[PDB]
């Protein structure tokens, strides 16, 4: 049950809200603490895996320029 | 016994070479004309090869430059 997506964020926020509205000891808080535990372990398993997201965009575009030129040249010889 | 059986293995042949000689001359003429045909078609071949080679060369330099 592990993936670090937006949906489990919204899960977190909904847990927070439900805690606030619930408010000695709390069965909603302990559910919240399980949730933050899960997200903590999900971020601990997390790996940085970073190359520049701006560079990412740029190489998407120049690579796409490559591909378009490839198909242009290929169809050029086939004609 | 082996010599005898080999003598039987021996096929009789005319000592005269006229039949063989004529065969020989036919083969020589034959390979001569086939060699001429090969020569004509071979010159045309090499000309063709030069043409395609030029088109190749254009392709190679163009492709390299443009993609890189």
């Amino acid at each position: 049950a592990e993936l670090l997506s937006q949906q489990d964020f919204s899960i977190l926020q909904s847990r927070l809200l439900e805690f606030l509205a619930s408010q000695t000891a709390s069965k909603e808080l302990t559910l919240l603490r399980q949730g933050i535990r899960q997200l903590k372990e999900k971020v601990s398993k997390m790996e940085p895996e970073e190359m520049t997201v701006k560079e990412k965009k740029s190489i998407i575009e120049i690579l796409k320029a490559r591909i378009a030129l490839k198909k242009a040249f290929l169809k050029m010889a086939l004609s | 016994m082996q010599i005898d059986t080999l003598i039987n293995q021996l096929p009789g042949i005319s000592t005269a070479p006229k039949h063989q000689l004529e065969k020989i001359k036919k083969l020589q003429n034959s390979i001569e004309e086939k060699q001429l045909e090969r020569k004509s078609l071979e010159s045309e071949n090499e000309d063709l090869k030069l043409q395609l080679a030029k088109r190749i060369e254009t392709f190679g330099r163009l492709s390299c430059v443009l993609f890189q």
Side-chain angles (χ1 to χ4, degrees), chain B residues 20-62:
Chain B
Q20 291 195 296
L21 175 155
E22 169 43 46
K23 184 159 195 171
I24 284 297
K25 190 133 190 173
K26 176 269 140 193
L27 288 120
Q28 158 55 65
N29 191 328
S30 187
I31 80 182
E32 198 290 315
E33 64 199 5
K34 208 64 166 196
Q35 279 210 309
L36 182 147
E37 161 187 346
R38 188 265 285 171
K39 167 172 177 176
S40 163
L41 132 161
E42 178 190 13
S43 172
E44 174 251 38
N45 164 85
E46 303 220 45
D47 187 304
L48 216 83
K49 285 194 192 180
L50 185 151
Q51 209 207 19
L52 174 145
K54 278 196 170 184
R55 335 243 147 169
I56 296 300
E57 151 194 6
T58 326
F59 175 110
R61 51 176 194 171
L62 173 153

Side-chain angles (χ1 to χ4, degrees), chain A residues 66 69-71 73 77, chain B residues 59 62-63 66-68:
Chain A
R66 272 190 185 176
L69 199 28
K70 319 234 161 190
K71 268 156 175 173
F73 189 27
Chain B
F59 175 110
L62 173 153
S63 53
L66 268 59
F67 270 64
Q68 278 108 357

